[PDB]
Design an enzyme around this catalytic site. Structure first.
Site, short mmCIF file in Angstrom:
data_model
loop_
_atom_site.label_atom_id
_atom_site.label_comp_id
_atom_site.label_asym_id
_atom_site.label_seq_id
_atom_site.Cartn_x
_atom_site.Cartn_y
_atom_site.Cartn_z
CG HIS A 62 -0.59 0.36 2.44
ND1 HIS A 62 -0.36 -0.57 3.41
CD2 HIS A 62 -0.33 1.56 3.00
CE1 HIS A 62 0.03 0.03 4.52
NE2 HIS A 62 0.10 1.32 4.28
CG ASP A 200 0.37 -3.92 2.77
OD1 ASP A 200 0.96 -3.48 1.75
OD2 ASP A 200 -0.42 -3.22 3.46
CB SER A 633 2.45 1.90 6.25
OG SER A 633 1.20 1.37 6.74
#
Ligand code: ZN
Ligand code: ZN
Ligand code: ZN
Ligand code: ZN
Ligand code: ZN
EC number: 3.4.14.-
Lengths: 696, 696
Positions: A62, A200, A633
């Site tokens: 992402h 991810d 992230s």
């Protein structure tokens, strides 16, 4: 456990780190350009790390999603299919604005910054401008060495200022992305949730000039050779094992007036969530008919989904923990304690009153301010207003140009204008313009803006249609026209008959007035904020609570252990998910449509040498009690020996209110296991060249 | 683990029992009239057990619900308020049909029964009538001692027959029931689910004459003095501890043809649930405006809800484990196996083809058969058909009268007609008659019933109207008219102008012929079933699989340990729930409306000496890997030393398909912790007298 610790707090967490299980010395962690901390990099709103001596960088899917999307078309859709470069020549550019920032140096500049501010005197707007000029000078000096970008950070309400210097790598290329249905398995349905089954991850390679020095993209560039890089764990991660993350969390609000919390929960979050859900629904509907809109709006739509779902989750978490009540009782206590202290407490009590008043001032115009900002953030109006403002700023000497419009900003601004080609469709933008015009018209008379009212020349559906019809004649739809205007001067904008330029010209004086207002408030905040937030810190310490600054996009460390959590009586969430749980969610339809090679490999129990006996499978994701937020992230998760065991990517549903009120029992990081990265790259979407280069 | 084991299988399960943690000797468990097994009693579709030397019997709330409902009105609702009798003189009768059966003797009679069956033709009907006759004589002999009732049971498809002899206590009184918001916390929402927070318990006392022999209710009767009763555990029950249940599971279908499964999955369960849901919707409406209809229909409603939800669950569990596939595949493999040994495997293979045809035969009329049976189960038609049939049987010698209509059945017949007063409202039943006529009219024309066609006057809304208007004329709505006809002779029924009686007199010849068709179908079954089932068993043995008979309302033992289960990857259900969990579900509305006293006791952490340290609270309910089914409610759960730790009351949602295909990973008992029974009786709805009586 709790705490986004600045590096300078290592002495204070050294003991706790050892107790939790860290086997590295704390001095080894304190070397921020050494092994392994020097392998951790910033991307600008995400974190990453080097994982090879030849410049390979791992982060979340992402995080790379923007870059994957910029290299995607309806006909050749990398989000859907993945990407894989068999050799480094096959890597594609991540886009002109992609960056990897490698930490070089951190400097405390608190004394100098606070003097620059003090030297402004009583006037709020001067105080803002003094701090700006201080920063601009500091950054110009620091950036005199070519290849480096510097950033000034204010911590704890302006009680501490530090300067960060970073090597700025500007040729970042996409080396690998698994298929979308791995990278975003479960989509928005599993976003912010556990159990979670999402692969991810994605890889970049960092490039520099043949002379070693950062450069923009060129085929003569070659891979960067990092000083330090992470290695994959050789010991299997299990439940209760030590983990730590270092990364760049963006923003928290744990030190906040109760009123700031109340406005956020009662107005800010619901309003934004609604606007974002309305835009989602229009773009979703149009993308179903038009695969060009679907691919061009996908990164935008991901951000809207993620933020709006986050806000729904925060609102629900506030109810679960009674955050309103907690904030009210805490503030009652702090003010009590202060009044308690006689005259010594008066400056914090007055600062509290000033901060409350400034919140009231921003509140009086919040609907106007938000609605105007988001209207002008549509693609043509945003291009028009940005570029017009640049033409104005370009007539001042650089040192006096507004941050964001200086010479050092020109690369980003230009990059933005080009990247928009992959993110704009006129018939889509039109409907967003129309939404915001209809929202504008609902504002009451005292939240309206004369310049926009006159430009609209009407208050009804026909006036909205006439305005849209007018804007549709803009030429800023093409990259070449946007770049022409990027280089043009102020008088050229003022002579133009382009209707989006005409809008930017008409509203700009109002934008500039509003900006002066925000700078004026900010200057009053500079006076009051440090003193109240120092009181809050002092109070928390007197209660024996953990003290660490709110997130502010600089480097932090968090640590703890692998563990589940208990959402309700009679249930527990286990620390790991497994391959079989991915397949169990299969439906053959987006977002639960794994690659067929995944389905086959799990059915055949091909565990690839990566099975953890203790859970009977390859692990997919896991939970841990680390304290992370937006910006973390892609942060590497390191084990007791500083080896890579995962990448941070999300928080569970109940965690998200911890932005305002930390809840230890239900606050967890969700990470993707390093073994799952490796398993995907073995059995599912193979990248044997990269596993080789990582010595696995 | 798996197994509803007959007491005669104790030698097989002795070592398994020790390994799971039983600390009693296996031969002490073998003593079915010893300590503790001699304390376990049958209620008739529920189990219970003795818990004092003065005849105190504990069972579930939903097992006592009939009795509580019978002693309830709109203006005193015991279902809502609970019941406590401070002295035994205060206990109210459970109603005339209520029973406690205390086990006296088991006898194998297999040789005799198979001889008597064999001794008949080779005519199917005669075979049924020969077993009927043989059972009746066994029972008549066994019942010759005043105070005993006997039952003949066929196990494993008719490979074994045993005769059970029981002391039949016929005066059962209610001693205590907690409020409905405790006994049925979570109502139908939590029914068949975990996490569970239901205090599903209630107490009776058993009474005999002053000579110590059974008798029907009278104020001269005195508490029964059991030879054995259970003691509450003195060791806290925790996760992984040994537990065992003994009780009376009613029916399982784990030995079944695949087409039996298919018909049940595809037709039976969907059809019955549909019908049950429709009646629920009707009665629910009329009771929300009508407290009398609401109270009077409460038990019927609970039954409909409970079975229909169970069936919805069984259907989902079929899909979750692909039951249809697993059945088909297992049948292939046992057909395979049998031809397999050609010569000696031939009787079994034949059997299969018979059983299969019989099933196609049932199948031919199944819609007729269900609709007619349920139409005749409405209150006035049921009473009139039952009573007229009794008049017909009373003309034969008692040894030839149909089972259910002999001298030994008269008490229960008379009892049912009286209990119907607390369960009948004429306006409500009218709507149910309507409902079932409507369903009859739409039978396909080859599944009509001639007599009912005639009785009706062809099939449309008009005839239905006229039907209903006509039956409204019955006097069978009153207990006294019903009892008048309980005593009347056959010609008195045939003379009657009661419209309900005239329906029965009209339809009976058909019902008798249909009964003959069933006895004939059964007789053929009596041939083929034991042989094919004995091969299913032989094949299970040869596969190392567990072999025990499907449940048949006889006494079984199941054992295992306290443990959770994991419905999905990334989660686990814990073995216990706690008090805090009960309070978390509070809404102040039915069914989540606990007594004020519970809410306050839990807020206060008043755990009454009952906290288990390991879970930090008083346990409420718990999960274990025992193998129970309908009929097992109220069964006492015993620990490693034979002490009471629980009552069985339910199964988790994914368990229920185990009726057809046993899934060990998702099959758990849900039990109510004996500590919660005690806690409720200390802190919430107190019964210090019963606690003192149980030495706690
Ligand atoms: Zn290194
Ligand atoms: Zn350029
Ligand atoms: Zn293995
Ligand atoms: Zn009588
Ligand atoms: Zn305690």
């Amino acid at each position: 456990g709790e705490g986004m610790w600045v590096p300078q707090q290592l002495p204070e967490i050294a003991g706790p780190l050892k107790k939790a299980g860290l086997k590295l010395s704390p001095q080894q962690i304190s070397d921020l350009t050494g092994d392994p901390m020097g392998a951790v990099v910033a991307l600008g709103g995400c974190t990453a790390s080097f994982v090879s001596p030849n410049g390979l960088v791992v982060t979340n899917h992402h995080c790379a999603y923007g870059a994957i999307q910029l290299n995607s078309t309806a006909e050749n859709n990398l989000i859907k299919n993945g990407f894989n470069a068999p050799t480094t020549a096959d890597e594609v550019s991540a886009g002109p604005n992609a960056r990897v920032f490698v930490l070089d140096e951190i400097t405390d500049v608190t004394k100098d910054a606070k003097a620059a501010i003090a030297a402004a005197g009583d006037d709020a707007l001067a105080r803002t401008k003094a701090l700006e000029a201080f920063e601009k000078k500091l950054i110009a000096d620091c950036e005199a060495e070519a290849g480096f970008r510097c950033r000034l950070y204010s911590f704890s309400g302006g009680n501490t200022y530090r300067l960060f210097k970073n090597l700025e790598i500007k040729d970042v290329r996409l080396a690998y992305a698994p298929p979308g249905s791995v990278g975003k398995f479960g989509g928005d349905i599993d976003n912010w949730m556990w159990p979670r089954h999402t692969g991810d991850f994605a890889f970049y390679r960092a490039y520099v000039g043949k002379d070693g020095k950062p450069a923009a993209f060129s085929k003569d560039n070659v891979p960067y050779q990092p000083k330090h890089w992470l290695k994959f764990a050789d010991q299997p991660l299990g439940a209760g094992d030590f983990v730590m993350v270092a990364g760049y969390p963006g923003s928290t609000n744990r030190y906040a007036l109760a009123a700031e919390f109340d406005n956020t929960a009662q107005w800010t979050y619901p309003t934004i969530a609604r606007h974002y859900k309305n835009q989602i629904a229009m773009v979703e509907a149009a993308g179903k008919q038009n695969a060009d809109i679907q691919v061009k709006y996908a990164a935008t739509m991901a951000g809207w989904n993620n933020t709006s779902k986050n806000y729904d989750g925060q609102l629900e978490g506030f109810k679960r923990i009674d955050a309103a009540g907690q904030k009210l009782r805490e503030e009652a206590a702090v003010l009590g304690w202060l009044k308690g202290q006689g005259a010594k407490g008066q400056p914090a009590l007055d600062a509290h009153a000033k901060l409350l008043d400034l919140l009231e001032q921003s509140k009086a115009t919040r609907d106007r301010d938000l609605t105007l900002a988001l209207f002008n953030n549509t693609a043509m109006l945003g291009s028009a207003t940005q570029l017009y403002r640049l033409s104005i700023e370009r007539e001042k000497p650089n040192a006096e140009r507004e941050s964001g419009y200086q010479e050092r900003d020109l690369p980003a601004i230009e990059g933005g204008l080009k990247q928009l080609e992959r993110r704009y469709v006129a018939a889509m933008d039109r409907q967003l313009q129309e939404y915001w015009l209809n929202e504008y018209i609902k504002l009451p008379a005292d939240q309206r803006v004369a310049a926009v009212d006159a430009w609209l020349g009407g208050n009804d559906a026909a006036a909205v249609k006439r305005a849209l019809d007018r804007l549709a004649g803009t030429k800023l739809g093409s990259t070449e026209e946007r770049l022409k205007w990027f280089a043009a001067d102020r008088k050229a904008f003022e002579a133009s008959n382009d209707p989006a330029i005409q809008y930017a010209v008409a509203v700009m004086p109002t934008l500039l007035k509003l900006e002066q207002e925000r700078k004026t408030r900010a200057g009053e905040n500079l006076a009051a904020r440090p003193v109240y937030l120092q009181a809050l810190a002092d109070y928390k310490k007197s209660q024996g609570e953990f003290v660490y600054p709110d997130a502010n996009l600089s480097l932090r460390i968090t640590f703890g252990n692998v563990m589940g959590y208990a959402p309700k009586d009679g249930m527990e969430y286990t620390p790991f998910t497994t391959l079989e749980g991915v397949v169990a969610k299969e439906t053959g339809q987006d977002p639960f449509d794994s690659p067929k090679a995944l389905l086959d490999a799990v059915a055949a129990k091909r565990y690839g040498g990566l099975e953890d006996k203790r859970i009977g499978s390859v692990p997919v994701n896991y939970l841990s009690d680390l304290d992370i937020t937006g910006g973390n992230s892609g942060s590497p998760v390191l084990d007791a020996h500083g080896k890579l065991v995962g990448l941070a990517f999300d928080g569970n549903w109940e965690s998200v209110s911890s932005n305002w009120v930390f809840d230890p029992k239900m606050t967890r990081m969700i990470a993707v296991d390093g073994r799952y990265l490796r398993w995907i790259m073995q059995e599912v979407y193979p990248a044997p060249q990269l596993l080789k280069e990582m010595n696995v």
